[PDB]
Ligand SMILES: [Zn+2]
Ligand SMILES: [Zn+2]
């Protein structure tokens with residue numbers, strides 16, 4: 001009765017944008033992206049991949065409340081490196097990792113029997 | 115299949131008006147049930 | 161009160177295995193443990209699904225209505 | 226290829242046992258999560274009830290109908306009704322199943338997912354056929370009828386994900402294990418006398434080399450090499466649970482990239 | 492003329508009409524028993 | 540799951556865990572007294588009422 005609709009977990013609201021990029025006040029070259037209608041599926045994966053970049057000074061995500069599907073992502077990089085470019089690269093690498101995994105699993109599957 | 119009341123004892127498909135009393139026509143049990151609407155209900159299979 | 165379709169815990173379809181479970185016990189004179197195993201209900205969440213089921217539907221069907 | 230690596234130990238119609246090497250923990254877990262929740266399937270999500278002179282209540286039955294597995298092979302070529310331009314449902318966004326059952330015999334009449342009949346125009350796509358794995362070929366006991374008992378119902382099966390309802394879950398449980406020897410000390414075994422004697426050794430221990438006591442702890446070691454087993458419900462074939470898993474994940478990563486592109490103007 | 496004596500559904504509650512009994516009492520009175528069915532799903536603050 | 544709270548598998552809940560039926564019966568009778576004037580069951584409209 002006071003429970004929200006289950007599509008509210010993935011379907012974007014009225015107005016509601018997927019990402020919102022706010023500048024971090026407490027640190028130079030830092031930023032806070034709010035991902036709307038997302039969980040630990042994306043959260044972890046993006047943060048984890050950001051840590052692989054040697055130009056990323058800080059990276060961390062959090063979901064302030066379980067009720068709502070949205071996480072905040074703080075990213076701090078070195079001078080002359082836009083965190084938006086850091087996030088872009090992060091995502092790009094992730095796809096190429098999955099791209100490989102996809103063909104690799106397929107290759108093995110076709111060599112299998114039963 | 116135009117229903118009104120069903121006998122609660124023998125499942126007889128009855129149909130009566132206020133000024134014709136309760137009871138089943140050849141069963142004689144004084145029960146009676148309302149028969150499902152033809153309105154037709156939808157359900158989310160959740 | 162019918163074998164649930166799917167194990168609450170894992171989701172494995174258990175609704176097709178009831179009749180088969182009852183046959184393995186009666187016809188094949190098997191024990192619950194091996195019977196459940198023969199139906200491929202390996203994890204305890206699935207074993208409990210069938211093992212603990214009370215099939216009241218039968219008693220309900222006993223009324224004429 | 227080059228990145229994450231696969232080794233399919235066992236392969237069946239409903240189970241894949243594999244080894245995921247050259248992957249970060251996050252990826253294995255994220256892909257585990259996506260398999261569990263974010264893969265689309267087709268399930269009943271509307272029951273029109275004409276007659277239900279059964280022991281069981283309309284919604285109880287309706288509940289089971291959603292849980293009934295349905296062929297979701299060609300699911301990517303069926304729209305979500307929410308996106309469909311039709312008013313309500315149609316052949317592009319949904320599959321219509323009908324169920325008529327009446328207790329003919331004196332003996333208890335049984336109702337099966339096989340007793341469901343597609344009425345929708347499938348337009349040549351492998352979709353909406355109820356999944357039967359039953360040896361006897363019945364699959365799922367929906368209900369039991371007695372004699373004068375009748376059950377007349379129509380049902381529209383729509384596209385969805387387990388995130389909205391578990392009835393759209395394409396997989397059962399997913400086995401997942403990394404570092405069977407605890408060489409990483411990612412866990413702290415509780416014991417009475419001896420951890421080794423008291424804890425059962427993993428099946429996957431024969432896939433890794435044992436620690437060797439006359440060696441110190443490896444600090445730079447990282448979580449890489451995962452022993453996963455994916456189980457299908459039968460809506461989609463096993464390979465697809467993992468391939469569509471891989472895809473759906475990359476699909477939603479791509480949307481983020483895309484969103485950055487979109488907000489980059491006005 | 493008339494005066495209402497109609498019986499509304501429990502303000503807070505809601506569901507589907509299950510069975511409707513229309514019967515006579517010991518003293519020949521037309522009396523009804525109206526059953527409403529609701530499925531109660533385990534929600535947030537439910538006790539176990 | 541603190542101070543006598545518990546966490547529940549929303550996924551299990553969907554699959555039917557702890558789901559209950561709830562029936563409630565409402566009763567009414569036509570009058571108590573009045574040898575001529577008797578209460579009546581009917582769908583009421585205007586009629587000055
Ligand atoms: Zn009668
Ligand atoms: Zn299970």
Ligand SMILES: [Zn+2]
Nearest residue numbers: 309311315318
């Ligand atoms: Zn449509």
